[PDB]
Amino acid sequence: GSSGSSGMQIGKIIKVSGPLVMAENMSEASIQDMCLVGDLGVIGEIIEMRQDVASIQVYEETSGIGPGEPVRSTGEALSVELGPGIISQMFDGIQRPLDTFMEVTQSNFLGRGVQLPALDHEKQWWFEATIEEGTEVSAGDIIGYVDETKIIQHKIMVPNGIKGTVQKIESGSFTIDDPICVIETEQGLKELTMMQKWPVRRGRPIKQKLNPDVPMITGQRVIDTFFPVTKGGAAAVPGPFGAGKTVVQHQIAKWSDVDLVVYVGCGERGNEMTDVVNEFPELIDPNTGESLMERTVLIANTSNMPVAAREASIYTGITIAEYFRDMGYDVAIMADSTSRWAEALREMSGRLEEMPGDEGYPAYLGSRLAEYYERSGRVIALGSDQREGSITAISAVSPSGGDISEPVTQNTLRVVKVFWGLDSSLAQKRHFPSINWIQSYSLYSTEVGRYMDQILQQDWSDMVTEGMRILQEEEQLNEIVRLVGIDSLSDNDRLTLEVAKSIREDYLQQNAFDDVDTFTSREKQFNMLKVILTFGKEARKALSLGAYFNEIMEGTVAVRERISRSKYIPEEELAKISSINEEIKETIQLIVS
Amino acid sequence: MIKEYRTIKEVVGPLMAVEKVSGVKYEELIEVRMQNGEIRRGQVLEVQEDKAMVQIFEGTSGINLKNSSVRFLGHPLQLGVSEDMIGRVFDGLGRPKDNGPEILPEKYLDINGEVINPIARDYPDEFIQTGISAIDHLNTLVRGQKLPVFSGSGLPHKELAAQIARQATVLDSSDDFAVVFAAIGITFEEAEFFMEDFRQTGAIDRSVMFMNLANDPAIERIATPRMALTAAEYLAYEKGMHVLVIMTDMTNYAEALREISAARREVPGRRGYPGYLYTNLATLFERAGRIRGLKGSVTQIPILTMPEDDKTHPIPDLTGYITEGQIILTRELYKSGIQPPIDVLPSLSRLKDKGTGAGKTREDHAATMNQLFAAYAQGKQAKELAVVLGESALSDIDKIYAKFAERFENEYVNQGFYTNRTITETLDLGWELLAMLPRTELKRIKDDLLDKY
Amino acid sequence: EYRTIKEVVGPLMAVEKVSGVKYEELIEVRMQNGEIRRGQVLEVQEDKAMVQIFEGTSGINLKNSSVRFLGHPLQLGVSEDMIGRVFDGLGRPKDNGPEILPEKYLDINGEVINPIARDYPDEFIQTGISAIDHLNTLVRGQKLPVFSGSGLPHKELAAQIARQATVLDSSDDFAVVFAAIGITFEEAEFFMEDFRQTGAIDRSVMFMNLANDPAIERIATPRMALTAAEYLAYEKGMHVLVIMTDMTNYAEALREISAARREVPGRRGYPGYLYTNLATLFERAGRIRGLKGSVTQIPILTMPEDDKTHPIPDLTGYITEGQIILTRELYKSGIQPPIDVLPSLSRLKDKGTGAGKTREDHAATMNQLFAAYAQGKQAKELAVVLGESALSDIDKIYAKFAERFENEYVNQGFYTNRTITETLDLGWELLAMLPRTELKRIKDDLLDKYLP
Amino acid sequence: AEEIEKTRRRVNALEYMTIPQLEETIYYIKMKLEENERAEVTRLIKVKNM
Numbered sequence A: 001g002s003s004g005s006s007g008m009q010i011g012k013i014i015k016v017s018g019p020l021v022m023a024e025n026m027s028e029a030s031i032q033d034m035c036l037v038g039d040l041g042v043i044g045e046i047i048e049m050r051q052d053v054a055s056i057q058v059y060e061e062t063s064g065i066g067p068g069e070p071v072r073s074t075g076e077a078l079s080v081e082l083g084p085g086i087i088s089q090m091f092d093g094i095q096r097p098l099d100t101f102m103e104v105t106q107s108n109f110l111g112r113g114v115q116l117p118a119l120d121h122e123k124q125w126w127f128e129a130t131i132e133e134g135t136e137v138s139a140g141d142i143i144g145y146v147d148e149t150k151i152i153q154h155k156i157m158v159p160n161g162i163k164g165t166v167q168k169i170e171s172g173s174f175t176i177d178d179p180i181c182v183i184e185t186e187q188g189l190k191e192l193t194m195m196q197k198w199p200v201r202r203g204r205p206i207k208q209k210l211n212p213d214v215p216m217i218t219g220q221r222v223i224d225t226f227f228p229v230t231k232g233g234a235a236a237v238p239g240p241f242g243a244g245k246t247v248v249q250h251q252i253a254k255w256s257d258v259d260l261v262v263y264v265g266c267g268e269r270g271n272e273m274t275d276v277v278n279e280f281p282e283l284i285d286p287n288t289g290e291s292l293m294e295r296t297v298l299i300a301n302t303s304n305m306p307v308a309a310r311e312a313s314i315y316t317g318i319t320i321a322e323y324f325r326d327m328g329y330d331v332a333i334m335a336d337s338t339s340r341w342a343e344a345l346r347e348m349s350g351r352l353e354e355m356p357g358d359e360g361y362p363a364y365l366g367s368r369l370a371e372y373y374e375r376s377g378r379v380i381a382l383g384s385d386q387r388e389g390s391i392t393a394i395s396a397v398s399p400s401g402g403d404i405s406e407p408v409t410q411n412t413l414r415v416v417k418v419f420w421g422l423d424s425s426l427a428q429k430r431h432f433p434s435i436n437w438i439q440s441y442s443l444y445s446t447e448v449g450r451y452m453d454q455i456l457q458q459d460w461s462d463m464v465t466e467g468m469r470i471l472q473e474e475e476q477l478n479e480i481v482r483l484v485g486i487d488s489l490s491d492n493d494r495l496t497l498e499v500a501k502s503i504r505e506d507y508l509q510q511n512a513f514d515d516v517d518t519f520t521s522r523e524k525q526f527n528m529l530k531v532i533l534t535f536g537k538e539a540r541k542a543l544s545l546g547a548y549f550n551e552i553m554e555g556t557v558a559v560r561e562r563i564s565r566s567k568y569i570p571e572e573e574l575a576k577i578s579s580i581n582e583e584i585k586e587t588i589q590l591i592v593s
Numbered sequence B: 001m002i003k004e005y006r007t008i009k010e011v012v013g014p015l016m017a018v019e020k021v022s023g024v025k026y027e028e029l030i031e032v033r034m035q036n037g038e039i040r041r042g043q044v045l046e047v048q049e050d051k052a053m054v055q056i057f058e059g060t061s062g063i064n065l066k067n068s069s070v071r072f073l074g075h076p077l078q079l080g081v082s083e084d085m086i087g088r089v090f091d092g093l094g095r096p097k098d099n100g101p102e103i104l105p106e107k108y109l110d111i112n113g114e115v116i117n118p119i120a121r122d123y124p125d126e127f128i129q130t131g132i133s134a135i136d137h138l139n140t141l142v143r144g145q146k147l148p149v150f151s152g153s154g155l156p157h158k159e160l161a162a163q164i165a166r167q168a169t170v171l172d173s174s175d176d177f178a179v180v181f182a183a184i185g186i187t188f189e190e191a192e193f194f195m196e197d198f199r200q201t202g203a204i205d206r207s208v209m210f211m212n213l214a215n216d217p218a219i220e221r222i223a224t225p226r227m228a229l230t231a232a233e234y235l236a237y238e239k240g241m242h243v244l245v246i247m248t249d250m251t252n253y254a255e256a257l258r259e260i261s262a263a264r265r266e267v268p269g270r271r272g273y274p275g276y277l278y279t280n281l282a283t284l285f286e287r288a289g290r291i292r293g294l295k296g297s298v299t300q301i302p303i304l305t306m307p308e309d310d311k312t313h314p315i316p317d318l319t320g321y322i323t324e325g326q327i328i329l330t331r332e333l334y335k336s337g338i339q340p341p342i343d344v345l346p347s348l349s350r351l352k353d354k355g356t357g358a359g360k361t362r363e364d365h366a367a368t369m370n371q372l373f374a375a376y377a378q379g380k381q382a383k384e385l386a387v388v389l390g391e392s393a394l395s396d397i398d399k400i401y402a403k404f405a406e407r408f409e410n411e412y413v414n415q416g417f418y419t420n421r422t423i424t425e426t427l428d429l430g431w432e433l434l435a436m437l438p439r440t441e442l443k444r445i446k447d448d449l450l451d452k453y
Numbered sequence C: 001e002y003r004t005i006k007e008v009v010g011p012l013m014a015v016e017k018v019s020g021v022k023y024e025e026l027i028e029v030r031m032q033n034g035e036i037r038r039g040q041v042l043e044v045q046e047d048k049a050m051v052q053i054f055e056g057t058s059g060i061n062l063k064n065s066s067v068r069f070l071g072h073p074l075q076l077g078v079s080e081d082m083i084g085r086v087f088d089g090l091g092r093p094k095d096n097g098p099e100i101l102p103e104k105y106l107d108i109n110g111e112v113i114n115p116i117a118r119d120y121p122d123e124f125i126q127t128g129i130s131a132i133d134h135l136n137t138l139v140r141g142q143k144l145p146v147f148s149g150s151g152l153p154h155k156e157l158a159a160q161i162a163r164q165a166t167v168l169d170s171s172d173d174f175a176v177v178f179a180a181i182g183i184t185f186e187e188a189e190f191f192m193e194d195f196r197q198t199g200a201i202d203r204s205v206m207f208m209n210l211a212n213d214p215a216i217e218r219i220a221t222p223r224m225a226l227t228a229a230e231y232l233a234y235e236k237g238m239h240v241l242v243i244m245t246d247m248t249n250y251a252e253a254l255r256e257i258s259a260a261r262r263e264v265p266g267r268r269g270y271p272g273y274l275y276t277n278l279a280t281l282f283e284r285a286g287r288i289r290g291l292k293g294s295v296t297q298i299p300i301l302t303m304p305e306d307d308k309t310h311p312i313p314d315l316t317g318y319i320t321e322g323q324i325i326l327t328r329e330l331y332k333s334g335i336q337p338p339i340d341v342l343p344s345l346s347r348l349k350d351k352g353t354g355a356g357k358t359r360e361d362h363a364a365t366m367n368q369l370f371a372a373y374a375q376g377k378q379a380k381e382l383a384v385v386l387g388e389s390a391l392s393d394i395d396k397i398y399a400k401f402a403e404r405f406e407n408e409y410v411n412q413g414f415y416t417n418r419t420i421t422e423t424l425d426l427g428w429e430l431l432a433m434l435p436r437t438e439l440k441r442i443k444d445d446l447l448d449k450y451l452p
Numbered sequence D: 001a002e003e004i005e006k007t008r009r010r011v012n013a014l015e016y017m018t019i020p021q022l023e024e025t026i027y028y029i030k031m032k033l034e035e036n037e038r039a040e041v042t043r044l045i046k047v048k049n050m
């Protein structure tokens, strides 16, 4: 060895430049292997290997690191700890506990070279087994559960790579480190724990993918009606600065019919993350009594934080989103924002001296994004149970100047089927959510239309299409109003613009901070759209009978107000909305006479 | 002997360099035995002195250099061709993915293929009835033709491809089409929908398919289309079948070659894409046509999504310079519910003149066709004026045209993704759209064809 | 002191045969004439180390020159005596006052605030401007910039805020850190003369960086101010305000050094890491749990071509919460300051409004004033396109209201410090023009209590 | 009044459609050309190092 003793391979740094560090004497290491760099011991990842030299993608700041400092490898890839104690905790890009970070470092700021486990390895969880001894098990089968939260049951599964029969299993209080079960595999006996590791850059395995045909209830009326996202679908929200990309994600992270939300603060504001860990512990569900924080794991790597850690934060979240997907749960993954991950790749590409493709971003940006969104979807999870898990991807895109022709927005539109294109002009007119109904689309609207029509037992797809037909006719009419004039419009066409006006500021507009409108149930949306549609249905009946335009408008002033306030009708009083339909006919009949 | 070395030099991304080797040929299929037992295929890109630079299709993820090996196979990447391929599902490299029996190969063909002698070529004048009036009348599709479908992100390009293979046939014959499909980096939802349509039709068993999804490594997408065209010409000229080729997404294919082009530090061209893109796409598109003396034929219907919906992008531009015409789907026509949203003004077919006329379709097809486009162009030109300067400001003669283009979009083009209209019903419909304009404005139809119809 | 200069190429310089040279380490080069120039390790490899000298490499003899490695990055000597002093881009004394004795030495890069230890913005900070104090409230710990243009009087508004900003119901715990980034000598003496005559120098720490100063001193100037700002706020418990201008000249100096080091240019020539580099400056603001005082930043930048999609204002809008727009149409009308509240926004104003942080009517009056202006301007536009006869009687009232709103409420003067009381009282007086039935966003309660 | 209305909408279209469509068009045109030559000389520096 050396000087009468031997030990593991010790590297030495030969080059330190920004987030990229190269060190010699690393032949025993591999690609995608984590490693502590320097005397400080900061975390890095090997990405390129030339002879003994390795190219390290460091996820911490490298200021004050020079050659001669040693580098120690871990032998394992970029992985995350998956077990009890993961929910209701926020992590950095490398999944370290930030609350534990402050307690150990005893400082309100972020140090360097701080080693901390992801989960709490000394917390006593009472385990509850669910399988019998001697039952043949494979990856995916459940051996027990642990009620992590009041309603979330952390079902312990068989880790990937283990296949055999259960030798001995017993319930009791134990930590994530001590064994709870023994499996008699073909390669011998194995000891399993409640914690398992999984590399973040490779997606977790499944049986097969399924078509997402179950529309998700987001509570937002502009979404669930015209541009619906399915359970397991992928939705991109590209918009300029202050157009409402995050706010849309906060509402989805709180009004979605999902069993777990995964919010990734990728390169966003630090105040946007503190607002989460304060409001979410107070968003109590009135049915289960469990807070929203009990139903969500968020990962946070802000903008001023290490640039390379933005990529780690993305793959950390989707891996956790896959870990709970395999339990048959419907998990939603929030990426805020993916445009900052792309900058980290372009930043890394400029350091590696690679050939830039479109607008400086590396040429492999299309695959890296496609590799991510395909890891979502409604799946058949592993195991003999054939259970259905799903991952719904809600990623935000922050283009320069709001120009969607930028690379990351186009590559996202290719692999997703929902496009919630935010508009700056709508955010200026206090039109919220600032969803452009002309440019946005959802490829699920046809399938959602079939599903939605059935439960409602009403031609709901024909009401959405008719409501869409009025809004597209409004765009064609506004070009003539600015050219010729509104007074030059016919009684029928001017009615269309007024009916379309009711669709805009009574149905599409939704305030995020107001309690009455922040959520709209599926049954409430039907009563609202039916009343707005019944207005124009009987109004054109009157214009064809001989009534004038202004005669119907001035004679319906009282009724026209009841529709504009229908958004604030509580769910226990939905009879008020539907009664306006019959009320309109009575008011229309006297006007005709 | 078994050529395998264990002296790795460096590993950078998808590329890899081995030193102290000998006898390594260019474009040679390799295998990488790692320190854990995994095998990942690859091809040689450059051989100089005792060094060899290779590209790993599945990528280099978690590879130790000191304890790995590289097994050179001494032959280019091949495909096990056999008639037992009919109705099988292979991956983007060729391995079967439908969990069935292994194919007993009748032959092993190089995926690069071969160049058909232009003297041995037979000019395709055959007529294909696609059931779509915008194709059968305006941009006629022939057997053995290179006609791609240009589309964008979100447009119903996958609905239009299933419609064509469902309704394709030839006049005065009963022959069936041996469809060959190839998925290149698409999502699972697009592929599954295509599978369900093929099942519904009953042609699924006839089709041979290669699958590369989005979660698959991007490097292998370079070989996946060459897998299909090798199997397509295998069933056409050697087995005597009429083969139809439909591929999507070709956009992801070009992105895959740029990744290697960027990894190899080559001299870039337009927008970072390699300079030999026109040639590389030509090795795939020119594998189509008929050969004199053989009953087979290879027809290609490529599909690509135009990046930023821009025709001047290098991907759809170079495709047009190779293929015979194109079929363009616009977001504006899909915006109006037009099914299929085919924009026939910028679209073109170049093999149709020999495929139309008396004895092939209709005597007067060419005169109606020519008369249609010209009047549609002016009618669309007038509509774009009506919406700006007003309806009344338009000339009365042009105003008749403004309605000409309106009905020629909602009734003529808009027919649905499940309507198989005949060629006689398509040409009779076209005259009904020309009867609006007075006889004096139909100047590119002769009196003989004007009088008889 | 190493004398192994290997290469001197442009602003860069390589030093071979070194031991223990760290990244981002500040160096000290002693030339053949005894003159001293400071540098910074841009990259270290093997026994080599590439550095860039701040002042350049003109007239350097690589043979007889020596380089000294200090062993620390660029630092700043912080102390309590910085209040009332003026420093340069590198923190060196400019007013020729007494020697400063630093208490500690902090890295100009600092450290990241732990998101779990971060405290949300609270209460409010008086800006003495009606368009800010009421419509776009500034909160302790908020990133709220001011978007301007070349020719617009953004220098007067910056000096106005730096002498009128304070904390209500608090005494002698408020300071203003004024940082100039690449400005002219006459524009520099503008603030120098204004700070001393108005007495605002007695409570301010000023860092001045001229246009002819080295471009590295231009990109290191805002880092000096924020390091001293975090010292007065987190170690001394003061509500510190940080005013910076111009940010455009910072972006030009950042692109100048990027082109000097031959980095891959991003959009519009600027570095692709411009969003990251700007974020390392704007994310310094915010409050900390269990820590008195706050760091508040008011960026001031000029929009090239008056275009908001430019990488300088656009990427800034992605970091900062909101923005303050200065338009040309209002500046030509004589509105001081020419603030357009239609495109402006304050995203944290909710933590500034309400009782005890502002008058109970603040939230209700703010939103009704906004809707009345938006309809009033919209009606004022209808009078030019379609004449005055196409607008109804209620339309001409809103159009008349928008005139008084821009000429009396917004137009206050660059030397007119209003209070939160006077601002809300001036706004209530303006609402009396509109009928009580038109004030549909204020509940009947606050209407009967304040409407004159 | 009819000719007044024809000219009126003629004028209106130019101010609200034709001229703004050009103004935004010129912006995008000039944008592309500069970054293209900016990224074109960038690779030429990299090729010079080969």
Ligand SMILES: Nc1ncnc2c1ncn2[C@@H]1O[C@H](COP(=O)(O)OP(=O)(O)O)[C@@H](O)[C@H]1O
Pocket: A239, A240, A241, A242, A243, A244, A245, A246, A247, A248, A427, A432, A433, A434, A510, A511, A512, A513, C347
């Ligand atoms: N759905 C909404 N309802 C009410 N206000 C909204 C909504 N969406 C956005 N806003 C307003 O826009 C501002 C910026 O929203 P945010 O989502 O942070 O923008 P970004 O697109 O930059 O993420 C918020 O402060 C909020 O006041």
Ligand code: ALF
Pocket: A240, A241, A242, A243, A245, A246, A398, C317, C318, C319
């Ligand atoms: F406030 Al932003 F995208 F501009 F999150």
Ligand SMILES: [Mg+2]
Pocket: A245, A246, A247, A268
């Ligand atoms: Mg946001």
